[PDB]
Design a protein around this ligand. Structure first.
Ligand SMILES: Cc1cc2nc3c(=O)[nH]c(=O)nc-3n(C[C@H](O)[C@H](O)[C@H](O)COP(=O)(O)OP(=O)(O)OC[C@H]3O[C@@H](n4cnc5c(N)ncnc54)[C@H](O)[C@@H]3O)c2cc1C
Ligand SMILES: Cc1cc2nc3c(=O)[nH]c(=O)nc-3n(C[C@H](O)[C@H](O)[C@H](O)COP(=O)(O)OP(=O)(O)OC[C@H]3O[C@@H](n4cnc5c(N)ncnc54)[C@H](O)[C@@H]3O)c2cc1C
Ligand SMILES: Cc1cc2nc3c(=O)[nH]c(=O)nc-3n(C[C@H](O)[C@H](O)[C@H](O)COP(=O)(O)OP(=O)(O)OC[C@H]3O[C@@H](n4cnc5c(N)ncnc54)[C@H](O)[C@@H]3O)c2cc1C
Lengths: 636, 642, 93, 93
């Protein structure tokens, strides 16, 4: 088809909410969803939760992700170039992510400083999207929405080990850390997985495929890269031009197909995809467009500015061989892989593979005591930003029952990693196109750590998460190789695997316990009676953690803020209704619009923004949204 | 939150009933359940029946049990220090037990001599809890209860082997030995397993997780060891203080969090954990609390006294290699575990693992003829306790289809074990704390065999269960090593494995049939046409058995009576509504309250205590208990059916 | 005189053998309390009256394994009817 | 008694096989000590049964220690009698 009413660009969660909600409000409404990546419908490598880890492989085979590399090297990350990947499939992040169920705090939304985006204003829309399939002691969660939430098929024994340990260092247990209210607490962590079917709660199957099964008004063009938005004499959005995913035409020559929108053009191509579409359409920084020879439609300098993310650190610890972890599965041990795939097929409701094995964690907040130990520059940010905002956590911390890390660089044995991220960084980045061509890479700059306030909290986390690991039953050591380069005689220096655990690994091996090389300081074997006291740290140790942070900090794929919703004169890009300033019929609804960060894993955030955008387009076209949505495939 | 209406301390059977009923009775009543152990919700090492056996391993890994050792060697057990375990997990015993469905006889309940606790007063509550999923020829059971009871997925060929042999020695068959009335008969033995889902029927998922799935007023706190109960100046319970499971804070240093109760505090921490809570809270033996520097709330010397149990013995026998047993699964043979785990997943309703493999048994009672041989001190007990109480059994006996013994101490091959326990022991023990601190082990004493009356029936049982073993098809001999130390020339001496059976175990073995050692006397090869006569025992063979009992008698995890319901002036701890003497807004509802023993595996009794407590608490808070209870996770949508 | 695809005593849906015990007896025993089953019991002889009325039945174990080989008959009486369904070989005896 | 004292001092020694030794009184300081827990768990690492006290069939040995100081088993007249009977029972050509 050549012409439709709505055209949604990019099939992220926000896009999937928008495309699905509208097509289902009014069967007359002809809406087309255009997606750069492949169709995810009934893909066993999308719907099985336990294989999620593979989606970030740079192995020249996996193509459910695009990888953006900092154009230049960062002084602040000791000379490395940060790699920020993002989704390249229908469902986007929802098809490939860690499936961790987290929600932002109430104040996060209030702090958007926009009518219609108060916690209060959005709470009913928060409940609309959720199908909550676990117990809790509040009334904060929805129970008839499309997106199913649960504790999955099987929680791992290390989950309650971690909690017992968190408790012992004064983080309290709670039934629900996702109650918009909690900033200092620890729970069993839920997942975007259907309790009954053991399948991933991807946005596309829930919102789009549900609809496309029962109506003929929702059109799906996958493997199609939106180049630019076509404009009217009056800056009204008339249509969209897309090219193929691959640039495999005769003579690499450009091939645009055009598709026109009667009523609305929505952009949902992501924090990284969206700004690029605006800029090559002629909507961005006036100068940058001039030099690339793109006719200006609207001078919005903040298109692609204020790139925010959450900053991940991964603390690896060794554990006992009787521990149950994902490591052998992640290595490719065929009969481990065969036992788990088979178990999932026969009984998904209790399968190990009906999980992400990130089965517990905490949101945390520093004491008065702890604040002093942090910097001047973080205490400044503390007063300005967190002091009278007590529902905001400073750091997120969770346990992976396995080593989220290249196993090609890991010794044998079992691991758990402390997955930690910075909830609200001060540090900031940017993205801008380099050409009119959509196939070329844009200029990129993570911006990670370019603000010195961002170190102290992360350093604080390393220390805190270490104290948890050390107090666990499964704990058998720190993986020296992947820890900060402490002075070897420093009381804070790593102790690696003990001899009894090591012998267990290779019981016929000739080399176990050869001291030669003095490559590690072994732990003493596990004592259930061992009294434990905090690791003390000197200034040198702290420097070694700072440097370790600079060396090993990454994106958490929670990218936002590149088409921000604030007054245009503050460098904003959109209205309180998400209309692009200086245009007609053009909206960004994805996480690009966020004026500030959210203390959460941002799948929830992207869905809500989607639900909100669906409301805003529904009242502008005089449509009414249907509850419940179209029944989701394979769900009960 | 920091404040709720009811607190339940310990999530065993009784505590799950109480917590669950009350939360479901009134959505506005905010109730909290605090459990020392870990959450058992959707844990395949709880909900799958056939792995129960692992839960008693003192192996460094297993933390689903806490293990109480006698403080001092018992002379009555020829020097040994007895070990009594008990649960350290939500659902308590019900999450880790043998899953044998047994009920106490009617007269047991009457003999509490407490209005509200007659057999007739409790029969409706008995029915209220059951979801009976097996045929029977009576109306004694319930069909809309939360707790599924069944024959499980597959009965082992030996079950009926065992029954034929029981019949052979004059113990009659019956449909239902758990009809409140039977003291002398043999049945197929049911389980706390759901016939359809193949899942263990644990109290937690039946009464707690069910409600938590559909209401917000039940709060669960696992990995929380209740230190003590906080008191008013008038001795009203105001709340409760708990510490972490693991003593692992900065410096092994105490970190109490406090939670307050508006209406009620219930202790349901079992026979061994409840008295400990009371004692460190200020309720117990005054002399004992003075010495430990604890301020007295109520001087109750019975707190921690009159500890009772059943006394298990385990006669092990070798059986044919074609016999079906759990031995190779329990040894951890790979492809045998792979097959049974796979089978349970694909068809729970017929899976071998949807069973506890304790598929037959009996309650028995001695004849006049047999009572003469049992000595003066049992015949005293008999006349005073059992004589005109004909629905009370003396011993229990059941067959496991596999050795319930450390297989690291057993020869190779297949076994069955005759699992026996004394039903109403005369012996008594005690349990007192040795500190305020909730991590220090209490003083403990089993009391096993300190009353010489308990030897005769356990001896009697051994001979009887042997006669049953010797008359089975599967029988291929006694495990000499694990049997009494008879004179080798005695007719009563053991006969171990067959040369034939032995050659089948190790057909390429070089050592099979080497006499050198005379370590065993081999049984003559099985003959289907064999004539079989009783073993004649002598006074010297009897001594050997007593010795064997002293050395190998054990708990049955059926602990009760440390907070006895009887008058204060008799040494009681609770009144007829389970209130703790001397206090207000404090009740003990678990098996600690029993003033006397019940002739039953005691999960049934604990739930009944649970229900009766739920009642008592409901009529004091003016609440109505809803029937049926909230729907149980994974259960099918539920009068008798197939 | 004719040839067919030959049917079986098997339920098409469950895959199970259509045995008579499960169809007629276990069905009933599951829903009512009036049907008594005694397995592993071999009937010796039908007890009779003076009027040659059937009054009851004497059954022994399946295994001949008592102390001196001594026969242990238990007796179950009948108000209304004794039925013999022990098969061509069993009944006559 | 002498060959025993040799066994106990060997590096490989992990315990006496209680089943195949004299019948000492359990509380006697001359009583056997069977396999230790760590050695047991190595035999059946996946076993559900290892380290179950129930039955008290054996006093487990202590786990092995190269630095252990060793002293002789003291024997009484009663122990001597146990061995005499053990010899009667098990002496061979
Ligand atoms: C590996 C990974 C782990 C994560 N972990 C978690 C977690 O643990 N918990 C959690 O809650 N969330 C997690 N997320 C974060 C969450 O998934 C994202 O924040 C969210 O999906 C963003 O939604 P979006 O609609 O804004 O854009 P996206 O999800 O990024 O989707 C954008 C879509 O647009 C398409 N696109 C891009 N450019 C173009 C173009 N020019 N034309 C057409 N289509 C285009 C892409 O192919 C993609 O499908 C993670 C994401 C990933 C990838
Ligand atoms: C291994 C085993 C085998 C058994 N076999 C059978 C059988 O075959 N058939 C049968 O019917 N029954 C059986 N039972 C018996 C039955 O399970 C118990 O009698 C029953 O559990 C008693 O219920 P209770 O509530 O009184 O105590 P429990 O079930 O022991 O529960 C007490 C709970 O309190 C908690 N607790 C204790 N102290 C504290 C504290 N200070 N703070 C916080 N929490 C605390 C514990 O973690 C536990 O969960 C067996 C039990 C076990 C353990
Ligand atoms: C191996 C075999 C193959 C057959 N093949 C087929 C086939 O392919 N198709 C088909 O339709 N039919 C087949 N039949 C035939 C059919 O099963 C029988 O003819 C039919 O079952 C007869 O039923 P009945 O009531 O006469 O007695 P039976 O079927 O013989 O059963 C009588 C019962 O009485 C019991 N009994 C005997 N003596 C005593 C006693 N003293 N006390 C108590 N109980 C006693 C026996 O244990 C037996 O269970 C087969 C039968 C057998 C055994």
């Amino acid at each position: 088809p050549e012409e439709v009413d709505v055209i949604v660009c990019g099939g992220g969660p926000a896009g999937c909410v928008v495309a699905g909600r509208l097509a289902y409000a009014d069967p007359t409404l002809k809406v087309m969803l255009i997606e750069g990546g492949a169709n995810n419908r009934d893909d066993p490598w999308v719907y099985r939760p336990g294989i999620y880890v593979r989606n970030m492989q740079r192995n020249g085979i996996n193509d459910k992700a695009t990888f953006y590399t900092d154009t230049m090297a960062s002084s602040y990350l000791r000379g490395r170039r940060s790699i920020v990947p993002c989704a390249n499939i229908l469902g986007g992040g929802s098809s490939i992510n860690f499936q961790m169920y987290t929600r932002a705090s109430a104040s996060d939304w209030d702090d958007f400083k926009t009518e219609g985006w108060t916690c209060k204003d959005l709470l009913p829309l928060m409940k609309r999207l959720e199908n909550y399939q676990k117990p809790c002691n509040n009334d904060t969660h929805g129970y008839d929405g499309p997106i199913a939430i649960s504790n999955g098929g099987q929680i791992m024994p290390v989950a309650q080990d971690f909690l017992r340990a968190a408790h012992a260092i004064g983080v309290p247990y709670s039934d629900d850390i996702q109650d918009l209210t909690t900033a200092h607490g620890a729970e069993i962590w839920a997942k975007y997985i259907n309790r009954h079917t053991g399948r991933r709660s991807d946005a596309a199957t829930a919102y789009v495929h549900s609809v496309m099964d029962v109506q003929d008004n929702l059109f799906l063009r996958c493997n199609a890269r939106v180049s630019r938005v076509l404009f009217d004499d009056n800056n009204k959005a008339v249509g969209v031009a897309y090219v193929p995913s691959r640039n495999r035409t005769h003579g690499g020559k450009l091939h645009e197909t055009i598709v026109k929108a009667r009523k609305m053009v929505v952009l949902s191509s992501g924090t990284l995809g969206t700004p690029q579409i605006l800029e090559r359409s002629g909507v961005g920084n006036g100068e940058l467009l001039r030099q690339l020879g793109i006719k200006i439609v609207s001078d919005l300098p903040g298109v692609g500015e204020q790139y925010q993310d959450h900053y991940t650190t991964l603390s690896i610890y060794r554990v006992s061989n009787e521990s149950i972890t994902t490591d052998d599965f992640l290595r490719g041990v065929k009969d481990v892989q065969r036992e788990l795939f088979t178990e999932w097929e026969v009984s998904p409701e209790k399968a190990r593979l009906s999980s992400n094995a990130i089965d517990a964690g905490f949101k945390i907040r520093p004491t008065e005591e702890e604040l002093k130990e942090m910097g001047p520059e973080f205490n400044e940010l503390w007063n300005r930003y967190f002091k009278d905002k007590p529902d905001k956590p400073v750091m997120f911390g969770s346990i992976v029952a396995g080593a989220y890390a290249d196993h090609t660089l890991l010794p044998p044995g079992k691991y758990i990693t402390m997955f930690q991220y910075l909830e609200y960084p001060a540090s900031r980045g940017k993205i801008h196109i380099k050409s009119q061509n959509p196939y070329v890479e844009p200029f990129f700059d993570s911006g990670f750590m370019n603000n010195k306030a961002d170190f102290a909290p992360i350093r604080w986390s390393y220390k805190k998460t270490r104290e948890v690991a050390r107090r666990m039953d499964a704990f058998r050591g720190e993986l020296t190789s992947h820890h900060p380069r402490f002075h070897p005689a420093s009381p804070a220096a790593c102790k690696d695997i003990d001899i009894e655990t090591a012998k267990q690994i290779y019981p016929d091996g000739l080399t176990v316990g050869i001291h030669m090389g003095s490559w590690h300081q072994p732990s003493e074997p596990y004592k259930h009676d061992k009294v434990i006291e905090d690791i003390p740290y000197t200034e040198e140790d702290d420097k070694a953690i700072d440097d370790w942070v600079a060396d090993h900090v990454e994106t958490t794929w929670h990218s936002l803020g590149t088409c921000a919703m604030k007054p245009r004169e503050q460098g904003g890009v959109v209205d309180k209704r998400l209309n692009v300033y200086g245009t007609q019929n053009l909206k960004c609804v994805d996480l690009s619009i966020c004026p500030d960060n959210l203390g959460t894993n941002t799948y929830s955030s992207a869905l809500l923004v989607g639900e909100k955008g669906a409301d805003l387009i529904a009242e502008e076209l005089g449509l009414k949204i249907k509850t419940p949505h179209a029944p989701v495939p394979h769900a009960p």
